[PDB]
Symmetry: D2
Subunit: 115 residues, 4 copies
Amino acid sequence: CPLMVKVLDAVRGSPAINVAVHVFRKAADDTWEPFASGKTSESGELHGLTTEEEFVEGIYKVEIDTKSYWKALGISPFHEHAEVVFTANDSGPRRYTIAALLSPYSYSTTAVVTN
Amino acid sequence: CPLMVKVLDAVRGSPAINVAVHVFRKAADDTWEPFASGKTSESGELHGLTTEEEFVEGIYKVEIDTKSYWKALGISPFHEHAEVVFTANDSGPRRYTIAALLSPYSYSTTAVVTN
Amino acid sequence: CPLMVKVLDAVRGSPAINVAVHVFRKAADDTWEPFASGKTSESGELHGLTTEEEFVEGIYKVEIDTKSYWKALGISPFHEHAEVVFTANDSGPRRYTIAALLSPYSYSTTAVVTN
Amino acid sequence: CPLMVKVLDAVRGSPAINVAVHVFRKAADDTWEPFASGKTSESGELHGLTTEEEFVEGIYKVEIDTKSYWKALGISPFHEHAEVVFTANDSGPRRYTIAALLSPYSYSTTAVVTN
Ligand SMILES: O=C(O)CCNC(=O)c1cc(-c2ccc(F)cc2F)cc(I)c1O
Ligand SMILES: O=C(O)CCNC(=O)c1cc(-c2ccc(F)cc2F)cc(I)c1O
């Protein structure tokens, strides 16, 4: 899998399970087109969003539905979601892991990119 | 000052100076309409974005132009920009400070909301 | 003010008030000798820890008493405290701000060093 | 393995390889006794530090040698190391993953604790 998303809970010290993730790709018309979506597993990970063939060069947006996550735990969080916007595969195919560590009023996101 | 944005550089250990920041407000048709913008000061801060009268309840997006910042320093960045999307609510939180701590492949963002 | 410490709460989206902070300086025998301490203010800041005359080059440790902070709020924390260990150097960096953003199972710390 | 350490590089967007890690356990005499040590692999991970039998209840300190890491890459970083101090196994055996995301003037650490 060339694209994996991992979400972690900084309040509980655990994976963030059942978190909705939507991925979009910027089209020629400059608009965000739907690309893939899924939900994190018991390990806080989301694999299988795409394939090397489908995951061509482009500008991608990964929207992590953090508000729904926090609300379901009784917390009214600051953010609507966490968004990660990046150019992918502009130097050939790479493998991307996008990670987000979540708190009610904060998040930290990083990427690990391998060849 | 109901809204302040502060940007820090984790590579240099300094404020992130001359960073472009664009604020948008969610419209009825769900499109993002320009609301306010500026460039961070020598202290990494951007004040005077809006007034209490103009800063009504609503969904806001703050886009921090991190890619251009890193390009000027000669370090390959991952993100197109850093985005913070939140609902402004009158129920207490009067002053909003959105902070972002920047690295080439990561950012951490928080909100400090005080009465 | 050559040294300032700032502590923020990622769960409440607020300064972390009344947090105990202890600063130590590395001695010849490699032991940590008490140097300065205090409690964060209503703004989450602790100023007046030391003076330019006293703040000589050396290795310093800043211990932020996060466990007690979280216990008072009724949230099970992971860490005993947050520690920041650094060498103070006269070669430019005149003012040191050590910041820590706190969650029950995580913290992010940065330094902003300005002339 | 009940204790695993993962270290990530926020400048390169990669695992942080060959990072020295020392673990200590607080003794009866209130001093830090050596407990385990190792270095992160090509995946930025360090497994095999301890066993369920040896990893008894106690206060542990995980010292991640970040300064040596940054120096070897030509960077003069702010911190001497990153230290993670926590009580372990005080409610029975748990599995701990301690993660640190590194920048020259900043780091973020989190823990994932499973049963
Ligand atoms: O003054 C306030 O309490 C709000 C304005 N500043 C910040 O929220 C802030 C955040 C950070 C910060 C942001 C992200 C992070 F991961 C760690 C941090 F310490 C650092 C500094 I210096 C700050 O003044
Ligand atoms: O395992 C990899 O090499 C890439 C996928 N995972 C992460 O990037 C990752 C990030 C974090 C992490 C994310 C944000 C942060 F501020 C600190 C962190 F330690 C924690 C863990 I456990 C992780 O496995």
